[PDB]
UniProtKB/Swiss-Prot annotation, chain A:
It comes from Homo sapiens. It is linked to Neurodevelopmental disorder with hypotonia and variable intellectual and behavioral abnormalities: An autosomal dominant neurodevelopmental disorder characterized by profound infantile-onset hypotonia, developmental delay with poor speech, delayed walking, and impaired intellectual development. Additional variable features include feeding difficulties, dysmorphic features, and visual defects. Belongs to the RNA polymerase beta' chain family. The gene is POLR2A. The chain holds residues 1155 to 1250 of 1970 of the full protein. It is found in: Nucleus; Cytoplasm; Chromosome. The C-terminal domain (CTD) serves as a platform for assembly of factors that regulate transcription initiation, elongation, termination and mRNA processing. Catalytic core component of RNA polymerase II (Pol II), a DNA-dependent RNA polymerase which synthesizes mRNA precursors and many functional non-coding RNAs using the four ribonucleoside triphosphates as substrates. Pol II-mediated transcription cycle proceeds through transcription initiation, transcription elongation and transcription termination stages. RNA-dependent RNA polymerase that catalyzes the extension of a non-coding RNA (ncRNA) at the 3'-end using the four ribonucleoside triphosphates as substrates. An internal ncRNA sequence near the 3'-end serves as a template in a single-round Pol II-mediated RNA polymerization reaction. May decrease the stability of ncRNAs that repress Pol II-mediated gene transcription. This is DNA-directed RNA polymerase II subunit RPB1.
UniProtKB/Swiss-Prot annotation, chain C:
Pfam families: Zn_ribbon_RPB9 (PF02150), Zn_ribbon_TFIIS (PF01096). A zinc finger (TFIIS-type) spans 71-109. Zn(2+) 2 binds at C75, C78, C99, C104. Belongs to the archaeal RpoM/eukaryotic RPA12/RPB9/RPC11 RNA polymerase family. It comes from Homo sapiens (Human). Keywords: Acetylation, DNA-directed RNA polymerase, Metal-binding, Nucleus, Transcription, Zinc, Zinc-finger. SUPFAM superfamilies: Zinc beta-ribbon. One of its GO terms (molecular function) is nucleic acid binding. Disulfide bonds: none annotated. This is DNA-directed RNA polymerase II subunit RPB9. It is found in: Nucleus, Nucleolus.
Swiss-Prot record, chain D:
The lineage of its organism: Eukaryota, Metazoa, Chordata, Craniata, Vertebrata. Its main location: nucleus. InterPro entries: DNA-dir_RNA_pol_su2, DNA-dir_RNAP_su2_dom, DNA-dir_RNAP_su2_hyb_sf, RNA_pol_bsu_CS, RNA_pol_bsu_protrusion, RNA_pol_Rpb2_2, RNA_pol_Rpb2_2_sf, RNA_pol_Rpb2_3. Mg(2+) binds at D758. Keywords: DNA-directed RNA polymerase, Hydrolase, Magnesium, Metal-binding, Methylation, Nucleotidyltransferase, Nucleus, Phosphoprotein, RNA-directed RNA polymerase, Transcription, Transferase, Zinc, Zinc-finger. It comes from Homo sapiens (Human). GO terms for cellular component: membrane; mitochondrion; nucleoplasm; nucleus; RNA polymerase II, core complex. Catalytic core component of RNA polymerase II (Pol II), a DNA-dependent RNA polymerase which synthesizes mRNA precursors and many functional non-coding RNAs using the four ribonucleoside triphosphates as substrates. Pol II-mediated transcription cycle proceeds through transcription initiation, transcription elongation and transcription termination stages. RNA-dependent RNA polymerase that catalyzes the extension of a non-coding RNA (ncRNA) at the 3'-end using the four ribonucleoside triphosphates as substrates. An internal ncRNA sequence near the 3'-end serves as a template in a single-round Pol II-mediated RNA polymerization reaction. May decrease the stability of ncRNAs that repress Pol II-mediated gene transcription. This is DNA-directed RNA polymerase II subunit RPB2. The modification Phosphoserine is found at S887. The keyword Transport does not apply. Two Mg(2+) ions are coordinated by both the catalytic residues and the nucleic acid substrate to enhance substrate recognition and catalytic efficiency. GO terms for biological process: transcription by RNA polymerase II. DNA template strand binds at Q429.
Amino acid sequence: KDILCRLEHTTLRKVTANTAIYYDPNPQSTVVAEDQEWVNVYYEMPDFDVARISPWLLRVELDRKHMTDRKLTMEQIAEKINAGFGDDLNCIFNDD
Amino acid sequence: NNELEPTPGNTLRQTFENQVNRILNDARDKTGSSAQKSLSEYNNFKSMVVSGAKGSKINISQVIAVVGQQNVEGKRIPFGFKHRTLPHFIKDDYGPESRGFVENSYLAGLTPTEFFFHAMGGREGLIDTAVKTAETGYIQRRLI
Amino acid sequence: VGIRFCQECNNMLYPKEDKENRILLYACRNCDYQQEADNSCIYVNKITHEVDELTQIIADVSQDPTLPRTEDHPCQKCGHKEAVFFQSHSDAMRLYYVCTAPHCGHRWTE
Amino acid sequence: EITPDLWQEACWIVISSYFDEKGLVRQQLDSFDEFIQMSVQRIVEDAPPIDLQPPRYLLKFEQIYLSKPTHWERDGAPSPMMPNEARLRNLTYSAPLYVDITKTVIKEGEEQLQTQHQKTFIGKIPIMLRSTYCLLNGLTDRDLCELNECPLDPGGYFIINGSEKVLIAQEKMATNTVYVFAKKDSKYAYTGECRSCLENSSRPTSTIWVSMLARGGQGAKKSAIGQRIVATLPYIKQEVPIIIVFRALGFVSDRDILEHIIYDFEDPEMMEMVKPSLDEAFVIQEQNVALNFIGSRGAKPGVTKEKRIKYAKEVLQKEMLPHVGVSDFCETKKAYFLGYMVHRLLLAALGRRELDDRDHYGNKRLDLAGPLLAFLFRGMFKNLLKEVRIYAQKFIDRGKDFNLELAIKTRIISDGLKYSLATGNWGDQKKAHQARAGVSQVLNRLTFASTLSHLRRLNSPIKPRQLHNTLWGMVCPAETPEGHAVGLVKNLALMAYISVGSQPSPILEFLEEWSMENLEEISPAAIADATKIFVNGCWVGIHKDPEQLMNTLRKLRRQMDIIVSEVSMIRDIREREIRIYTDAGRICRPLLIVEKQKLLLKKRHIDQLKEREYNNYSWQDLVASGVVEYIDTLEEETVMLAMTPDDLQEKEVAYCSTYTHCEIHPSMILGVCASIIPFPDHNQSPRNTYQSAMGKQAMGVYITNFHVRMDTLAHVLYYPQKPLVTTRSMEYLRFRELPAGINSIVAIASYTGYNQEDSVIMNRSAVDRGFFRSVFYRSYKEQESKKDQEEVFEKPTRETCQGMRHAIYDKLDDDGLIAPGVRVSGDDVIIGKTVTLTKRDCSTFLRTSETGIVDQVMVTLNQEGYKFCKIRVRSVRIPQIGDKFASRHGQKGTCGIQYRQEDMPFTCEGITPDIIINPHAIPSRMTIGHLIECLQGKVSANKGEIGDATPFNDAVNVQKISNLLSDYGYHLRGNEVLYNGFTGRKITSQIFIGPTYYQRLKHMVDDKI
Ligand SMILES: [Zn+2]
Ligand SMILES: [Zn+2]
C-alpha cells in the first residue's frame, strides 16, 4: 500500500472537505472560536509574524477517509506548500 | 437501504451493476448446462453439437431454456424516456426485467415488451457487422 | 455567502477591507454607498457537496401517476400511509419519500 | 357493460374502424392537402407588396385560385388530364394556379388609378394523386374502373415527366425549444442552444447559443474568478457576454438583470455562479455603449457610432429569437426568454437537472410533402417577385403604362417545383452542392407490400443508428435496410400518425379566459412557485394551481370543443412547467383511456362499432366521445401504459395502480413489411430484420391494372396464393386481394446433397404444373425528335442506311414498329429509328437476348407534339436451377437441382414435397418460426380453417397446435415417414413435412445470362 500510494497523482482537490475565505486580522478574535486553542499555540511562541501578516485567512478543511487512505501527514502537506511557494505564504498545520 | 459495501475500485453505482450482472449470467448458465445434458440421445440438435460440425452450443440453449440478457454498449438497457425504459414501467425500476433480461425462450414465444428489447440487442450487433467490413477489409488490403 | 445588492443603485457590492479601521466593508463602484459588513466571510467553496436533497425535493411530486406509490411507511406526522417514493434524479441509490393526501407534502429519507 | 375475456375480438373491431377511415397513406393526404389549403394562401399573403417608385407603383395580391389538373394540349385547346393518361405520355400531373392582383399607380396630382387583374395565370403545382384536387377524388369504385384505374392503388405520389415520385420524410431537429447538451473537447463546459423561428415564415433560423466557459483558464483572466457565460449571437463573429446583451435591452441595474435570470434570490448555490460574469461586463452601463459594443462586431463593422447604434438595434429585435416577438416593442419579452436559457444553463452546470439526450425523438420533428414544398415555394415566390422588380424598374424611364400579364414569367414556378422534385437536389439548380438530396425517390412496384412500405418512411439526416427507447409505438423496430445504412432509414408503424399543423391562437385566447396573468403583470418574486406556461416554445404567462389547468385542458381535447385533437399538452412536474404544442410535424399515436381503475371503452360502444354499415359510427364518434386519445412521443415520458387490459387491471400483488392509458393491441408497433411475418416473437431478431428487407423483393401481383401499364421491371406471378398461416393485420395491409407467393409442401431433410446450407431441392414435376411460373414484362422509351438533323420512325433497307448488325428486319412493319404477337429473338430490331444524314442508323435492340413476345405497342404524342412509342416485350420465366427463393422466416436460398415426382421421396400416402431445405439451416440461422408455420399449415389444411399467427396472441402455443394435429391421424410433432426416392427403402429416421409459404425473389438466374 506504500508502493500503491506513490504512483497516484494526488492533488489537494482529492482531500479537500471544503474551502472558504474569512477576514480575521486578529487571530485572537477569529470567527471560529474552536480553533482559538491551536491558533494561539502557533502564536504563543510565534514565528515569522515579523512585519505584517496580510489580514486575510484562507481556511481549508481536510478529510478522514482520503487522509488515512494514503497515510498523509499534516507536515508533508504544509512542508510542500512552504517549499512550493516560499516562506511568504504563512501555512499552519493542525492536528488530526 | 445503504446496506451494501462498495467494493474498492468503483462507486456504489458501478458495483451495483456488477453485483446484479453476476446473478443474471449464472441463471443464464444454470439454465444452460441442465438443458444440454437433458436432451435425449436421439435429439437432432444433439447430433449437430456433439458432432461438433456446427459449433455455438449457446445458440440452441436459447431455443429451449432462456434467451438471457440484452445489452447495448455493454450495459443493460439505459433509461430512455425519463428513468423509465418503456412507458409501461414505474420509475426506480432496476429490476430483473425492466432493464432487459428475458425469462422466455423462442419456443414459448416472447412477451411484447421483451420483443422490443431483443430488437435493441439485435441492432447493436447488426451495425458492428456493417462497421467490421470497413475495418478488417482495410487492414488486410493495407498490410499487403 | 449570497449576493448583497447595492442600495438605491441596485448593483453588486464588492467586499473591501478598511485598513484605517481594520474592519471589513462592502462597496459599490458606480456610486459611493457602503455598508457595515456583519458577515466576515467572502465565500465558501464546498467540495463534498453533502447536500440535503430535501431542499430541492418538491411536494408537488405527489400527483404524478408514474411513481411507485407504497403503503409500507406511514407519514412522519400525519399518520397517512400513502408514501410515494423515488430516486435522487441527480454515487448513491438513495430513495426519498413524499407523503400523498395533499396539504401534507412532508418528505423524509430512509 | 365490461368485456372480461371477449377482449380479443373487441380490439380488432376498433382497429378495423381505424384503417377504414385513415388508411395507410393519409399522412401524405393530410399533409399535402393542408399545404394547398392554406400554406399556399399564407405565403402569398405575408410576402410584402412590391412598392416600386414623380410616380409610384404598388402591387398587392389577393386570394388565390386553384383548379383541377389540366393539359393545355398544344393545339390551342385546353383539356383536363387523368393519371393513367399522364403516365403514358410523360406528362406532369399538375393543376394551374391563379391569383387576384390589385395594382395602383400614382400619377402626380393627388388622384390615383387602381386596376385589377382577375384570376391571372401564374403557374402550376404538382397535384398529389388522390387528394381532394385530383380528378380521382370524387369518384366511387365502379366509376373509377371506367378510366383504367385501380381501387387498391393507395395514392400519395405525383407523376413527374411520366415516372412516379414520393417525397420521403426528411427528419430534422425540433425548433423553438431550449437544448442543454454537453460537449467533450471544446472551449466550453455545458453549452445551451435554441433554434427559434415563427410559423415557418421567412427568417429560417437563428441558432443562438448560450455557453459556459470551462475552468481550465490560464492566469487571473478566468481561473482567479471562475467560469463565465457568453452568448454566440448570430451575425456576430465573437462571443458577446451575457450582461452586455441585457443592457442593450434597455436595462440598467443589476437587480433588474438578475430578476430575469434567477427566480429565487435566497439560494446561495446559484447566486455564486452568475457572480463572475457580472465582473467582466462591468464597465458598460448605458444602452448607448453596450449597443455600440455589440454592433462593433457585425457583418461589416460600421465607422460612426450612429452606425453601431443603428446596426445592433435591428440585430436584437429582428434576428435574435424571432418567435418570442418580431415587433419593435418586445424588449421586455425577449428579456425573459433569453434570461430563461441562462437559467437552464445553470441548472445543468450545477447538476441540479438532467441534460437533454440528443437522440430522443421528443426533440425530433418530421416533415412531409406539405412543409417541404412550403420550403420550396418560398424560395420561388420571391423569384417571381424578383423579375417583376426587374421588369418594372426597367420601365420607369418610359412611364408610358405598365402591364403585368406579359410580366409574370410563369415558367419560374412550373420548372423549379418540377426540377427539384424530379431529381431530389432539394433547392434551386444554381447552387447544387448546398442542398439536401435524397428527397423524392422513385417508387417501387414489386409486391404491393413494398409500395406501401415505401410510403411510410423516415430518413435520418446523418448515435443515429442504434435503436432508441422512444420507438415503442411510433416506428417499426424490425424493419430497416442492410448494408450502408442500418437504422438511418426507418419505416413507420401502423398506428403512427404525424400531426398536420394548426394555429395556436384559440388556445391563448382560452387561457386568459380562465387565468394566467401575462408577462406584463408579474412581479417576478411571484414566479418562484408558478408553473410556467408555454405555447409553441413561446413563453406566455404563469399559473398557481396547475391541477385544475391540467384537467380543464384535458377535457377539451377529449371533447374537441376548442383544442383540436391534434394538439398535445404536456405538464412536467419537477421542472414545474406546462408545455402546449400546436406544432406542425410531430408524431402521435392513439391509446385507450383508463379512468381510475378500468377503461372507458365500454360494451355499449363496441356493439355499435360492430354494425359499421348503416350506423356510420366509425372512429370519429369514438374520438369525440372521449375513449381514445392521441399521445405523442414526449407525453409518453409522462404517462403510464398497460400492455393488456386483462392482466394489468386485475389486482395481483399491486405492481402499480395508477394506470392512465392502455394500448389497443401490442402488435401494432410493427410496420408494413414486418407485419407479414407469422409469429415474429419466435424469431431471432436478425431474421425479422432480414425478412423485412426481403419482403420488398418477392414478386407478386402488384397492381391490378398491369394490362394498361407500360413499366420497365414488371414481374407478375401466375397463381399467387393468400397464405394458409396469416396475421390478423394482413387484412388491413391488403394482402388477400393481392398476395405474393405460392405455398409448397416442404420437407426438412438431408438428401442427395444439393442443399448445401442455403440451397433447396425443387420438384420438376411440380414446376410443370405452373409452380412459381411467372412473367417478366419490359418497356422501351422512344422519343422521336425533330430538331437540323432530325429522325423519324421508318424501316431501314440494308443498303441505303449506315451501320447495323445482322439483325434481320422481318419483324418490322410498314412504318418501323413491331405489331404485338410477333416473337422477337435475341438482338433483333424493334424500333428502326434513323437520324437523317446516307442516313445514320439508331436501332433499339432487345437487350439481354431473352427471346420473349412483343405484347403491346402504343403510339402517342410527347409533351411537345412529337410522336412517341412504348413497347412491352413479355417473357415467361420457368424456375430453372439458380432462381432464388426465400420463406417469410429469413434464410434466402437458391435452387440446386430439379428432381422428379418419380424421385422425390414419397409419404405413406403419395405426397412428394415440392421443396427440400437443409436441416443445418435451422439452429444457427435460428428461426423456430419456420418449424411452427410448417406445423400450422398442416393443421389448417385439415381443420379446414385458415390459421392464426398473430404475434402475441397468447392462445396459440405449440401444445394445442399439436393436439389439434393429433385429432386427424398424424404425429403431433409434425413428423411423418417418408420413403426413399430411388430404392423404395423406408428411411431410418422420420422427416418433418408441412406446407410453408415460399416466395420467389427477383434475384433471378436469367437476369444475367
Ligand atoms: Zn451602487
Ligand atoms: Zn402525511
